[PDB]
């Protein structure tokens, strides 16, 4: 479900995509991301909340 696809301002979640596989994952792991940037390029990034 993505808010941006439909009501971006509202923040309401509307399904935009479906996964064909019937099996549903029982576990989820966030993948850590590090920006590859020089000291001047370094910038703050918005937090992600689960």
């Amino acid at each position, epitope marked *: 479900f993505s808010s941006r696809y439909v009501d971006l301002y509202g923040g309401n979640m509307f399904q935009f995509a479906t996964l064909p596989v019937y099996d549903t994952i029982k576990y989820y792991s966030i993948i850590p991301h590090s920006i*590859r*940037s020089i000291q001047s390029d370094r910038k703050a990034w918005a937090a992600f909340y689960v």
Partner: antibody
Framework: EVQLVESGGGVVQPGRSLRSCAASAFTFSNYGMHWVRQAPGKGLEWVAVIWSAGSLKYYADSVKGRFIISRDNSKNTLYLQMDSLRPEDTAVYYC???????????????????????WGQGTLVTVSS | DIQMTQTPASLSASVGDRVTITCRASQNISSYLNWYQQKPGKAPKVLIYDTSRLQSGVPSRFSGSASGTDFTLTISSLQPEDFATYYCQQSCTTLRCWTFGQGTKLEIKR
């Protein structure tokens, strides 16, 4: 301050099993330990290479299972097993960790990321007749 | 695997004279090529790791330049203590071949 030593080296008969290397003042689990054999008049080659996990063991093409590597990270010691020993096989064995230079060149950005310090002194095994 | 033969089995170098040692691989399989100097009774020391950046603790006079498969190491003002047997090994994750150096020994000219 890191100490690397090889133990269990001794004169042996042909077709014999000889058990190695030990690391002191260092964390064995973080760095993979690799055994290198040097023969006089010849270049050093890594007969046995062991990953830090120890799940994957790498054997040189020259040795057909002659060298078997088992490492105890908690013990901080790497055990090398030698079988079907031969006069030609006789050589000095050095154990040292090996590292490579991995980096992303966003702006010609390169990191050496190398540790070759505390290279093993080496041990000599011989066949006597 | 890879078959590597150094062009000179032994090299004679006079003190204060520039000399070149060339090791030729069967092919340049990987970008990283390591040249090492070995002293008997002493642990091996790598002169260069990839032939593009000099290893720390190695004299600036040593230079590694590779043309085609062959790799040439240049020594300037060579000294008896500086002189050592040289082994070149192709460096890649896909080792196992464990290619090694034939060994070139430098002797003072007198």
């Amino acid at each position: 301050e890191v100490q690397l030593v090889e133990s269990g080296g001794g004169v042996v008969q042909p077709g014999r099993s000889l058990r190695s290397c030990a690391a002191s003042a260092f964390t064995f689990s973080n760095y993979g330990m690799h055994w290198v054999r040097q023969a006089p008049g010849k270049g050093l080659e890594w007969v046995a290479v062991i990953w830090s996990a120890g799940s994957l063991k790498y054997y040189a093409d020259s040795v057909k299972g002659r060298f078997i590597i088992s490492r105890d990270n908690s013990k901080n010691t790497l055990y090398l097993q030698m079988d079907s020993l031969r006069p030609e096989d006789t050589a000095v064995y050095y154990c040292a960790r090996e590292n490579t230079t991995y980096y992303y060149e966003t702006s010609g950005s390169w990191g050496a990321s190398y540790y070759f310090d505390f290279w093993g002194q080496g041990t000599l095994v011989t066949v006597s007749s | 695997d890879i078959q590597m033969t150094q062009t000179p089995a032994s090299l004679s170098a006079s003190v204060g004279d520039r000399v070149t040692i060339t090791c030729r691989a069967s092919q340049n399989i990987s970008s990283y090529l390591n040249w090492y100097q070995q002293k008997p009774g002493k642990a091996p020391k790598v002169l260069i790791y990839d032939t593009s950046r000099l290893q720390s603790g190695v004299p600036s006079r040593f230079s590694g330049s590779a043309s085609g498969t062959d790799f040439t190491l240049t020594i300037s003002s060579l000294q008896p203590e500086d002189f050592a047997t040289y082994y070149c090994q192709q460096s890649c994750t896909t080792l196992r071949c464990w290619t090694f150096g034939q060994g070139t020994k430098l002797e003072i000219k007198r």
